[PDB]
Design a protein around this ligand. Structure first.
Ligand SMILES: Nc1ncnc2c1ncn2[C@@H]1O[C@H](COP(=O)(O)OP(=O)(O)OP(O)(O)=S)[C@@H](O)[C@H]1O
Ligand SMILES: Nc1ncnc2c1ncn2[C@@H]1O[C@H](COP(=O)(O)OP(=O)(O)OP(O)(O)=S)[C@@H](O)[C@H]1O
Ligand SMILES: [Mg+2]
Ligand SMILES: [Mg+2]
Lengths: 284, 284
């Protein structure tokens, strides 16, 4: 499994043993179609292979992650759906078991009822709801990985307030400095009010065309912009036909290019862990 | 232009002459990828051909409609973007002119700042913002057509409160009775509080596979369910490779299948007008 990857996992497990509860990671950005749900699926898959105990959370009406995971894993309907769990103030009956390692709180269209549920609440109580209900679950997991909508909403606010770390997938050529700074301002707003320890892991570039001069050049410029803070991931995600195959048939390892495309996701995953480890080692 | 279509347009213009201001139409549903933005583009295109004076409103951070329209029309940047117009309490400087008939308020990523802007406002003042700023513009247009996000949010609430009629595109096989009723409950909530005259035009089926037994059968069942209220459109939208061509190159009429795919959109458009006319003829 490579020595360096083994060392990263040992270090993760050591940090988790010090923390004594899960680290919560959010994949988020306000553009659709940049691979947030796909990264989430591939992280679920990889963590299960690595025997990490993980809770995936699909906080999207569309339930994209849930339906995608169901291509590879047996995904049951939960006794109580995510929206009803939130309404009941307990998420315990909303968890399904994909493997002995991998759990999921599935998405449901009933999440559309959430903003009405919380309409009369204080902004604080609305925004802290997910965090409050995740708190008792964290001792049961190594990682909790949240996927949600791209539109600023009750969903995004809950996800951000519940998380320790945020991964930001984006297409460099589609974003401007202003876009990124505005998005970061949104995170800062919620961090200061409700979640001061929130950290950005970094930006995860998505490259839809490997033979595009403008795509290459915009990516170069993003790296330049973030030379000092080092926020741009060194390992990136490239569009692959293989992902389309896995989205139809389920994820496999025994076919041509399966292991090569898997290593692309693995390299992002491990870079994410490295970045988390560095931040955790710095921490209080 | 066919006699029956000419009669529908005369009747529209007669109704608009009685109203003395634009009718506002919203394409909305809480599932992504069902052709809301595409229908909006095709309605912009068709109305321009018919010399109807139309304001398109792209209330989406992703600006999908805006970028799509820019394939066919010259789309300038507005002096003041949509978010800043909302913040300034005037949308007049946020309008661009695509043709002598067709105007657009373009989408902008800066719309992400809206929920923070309105955070301290009453739910009423937050929800009525778009309607309030559209009011002075309506005398200048025959139709105002709004496209927005699929996620329940400040955006959806503003769009719904501003509109006279809602068109609901969906894939029948992807929805359940519960989904539709829950969505309709959301409309009802805002209708009762802020917009009692709001009418649903109907459901516009999107068929992604013409050779699918389950897709056909789910569509049949939806029609059965709505036998009495007649809410399901008789004219539907089918997936077409041509739409992919127009999305890359712009809309054309001089190529193979151009006019056939255009008539598909035209038939939905005219059915929409028929349905609006029937409701208007009933009205106060
Ligand atoms: N590396 C990849 N190669 C090829 N296809 C991909 C890749 N990553 C994602 N996709 C596909 O692109 C589409 C969008 O990816 P998602 O992960 O669903 O995006 P998202 O960022 O979650 O979008 P939302 O939730 O609308 S903001 C899906 O059909 C994926 O299967
Ligand atoms: N009839 C059609 N045939 C082929 N492609 C289509 C058709 N209608 C839409 N599309 C394409 O399908 C994709 C989704 O359509 P949109 O109109 O963007 O969906 P939407 O309902 O606006 O989605 P959101 O805003 O994420 S909820 C786009 O790439 C369109 O170009
Ligand atoms: Mg997603
Ligand atoms: Mg759209």
């Amino acid at each position: 499994m490579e020595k360096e990857e083994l060392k990263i996992l040992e270090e993760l497990r050591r940090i988790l043993s010090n923390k004594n509860e899960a680290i919560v990671i959010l994949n988020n950005y306000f553009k659709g179609g940049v691979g947030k749900s796909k990264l989430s699926t591939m992280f679920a898959y990889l963590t299960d292979k690595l025997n990490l105990k993980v809770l995936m959370i699909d906080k999207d009406l569309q339930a994209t992650l849930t339906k995608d995971l169901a291509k590879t894993f047996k995904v049951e309907l939960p006794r109580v759906n995510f929206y009803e769990g939130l309404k009941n103030g307990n998420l315990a009956s909303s968890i399904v078991h994909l493997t002995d390692n991998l759990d999921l709180i599935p998405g449901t269209f009933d999440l559309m009822l959430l903003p009405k549920l919380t309409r009369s609440w204080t902004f604080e109580n609305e925004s802290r709801l997910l965090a409050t209900l995740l708190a008792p679950l964290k001792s049961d997991y190594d990682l909790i990985i949240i996927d949600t909508v791209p539109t600023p909403s009750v969903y995004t606010n809950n996800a951000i307030v519940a998380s320790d770390y945020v991964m930001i997938p984006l297409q460099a050529e589609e974003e401007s400095t202003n876009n990124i700074q505005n998005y970061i301002s949104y995170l800062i707003d919620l961090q200061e009010q409700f979640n001061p320890g929130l950290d950005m892991i970094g930006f995860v570039p998505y490259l839809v065309d490997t033979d595009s001069a403008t795509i290459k050049s915009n990516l170069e410029e993003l790296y330049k912009q973030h030379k000092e803070d080092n926020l741009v991931f060194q390992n990136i995600i490239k569009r692959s036909n293989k992902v389309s195959t896995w989205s139809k048939n389920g994820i496999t390892e025994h076919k041509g290019y399966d292991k090569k495309v898997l290593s692309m996701y693995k390299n992002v995953f491990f870079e994410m862990l490295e970045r988390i480890i560095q931040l955790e080692n710095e921490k209080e």
